[PDB]
DNA sequence: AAAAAAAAAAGGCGCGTATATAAAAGTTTCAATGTATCTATAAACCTTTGATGTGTGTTTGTACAT
């Protein structure tokens, strides 16, 4: 549905305006809404350097609202995974805001313009 | 008293002190990367201990033979 088109959407900019790596992280949560965090870490097969900066921007766009997936462990202990549940809505609306600021960058810029005044 | 082996002793071989020329080969040293190994630490359990509704309990009022 359109919901394609918001992941097709959120592909777009993230390769659009951001580079190509950006996308990877996408498509592969996108696999499967509640998903392990190291399955992602695990088929990349990267570092969390070339991890860490990247979960940076999922949560800084607030496009991978990575939920904490607990599981109940065999041990009777602590479990979780870091799940994006993504939130569509929000992580868009920040976004069309971001873009509105932009365009502030450059409506207001209208002023800053073609004759010489000073 | 006589024979044999090592040291006492010096002068010099021969390139370290620069030393710059340039090519020719190679080394080591430095730093980014990768990994098992400490640790705390706060998040897992287990036990403890102070606060707690209440099952059982003292008065009220009872059908019921006695």
Redesign the pocket.
Known sequence: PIDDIVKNLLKFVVRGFYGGSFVLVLDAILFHSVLAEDDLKQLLSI?KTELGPLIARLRSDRLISIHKQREYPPN???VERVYYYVKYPHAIDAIKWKVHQVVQRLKDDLDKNSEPNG
């Open positions: 570092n009777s202990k602590s």
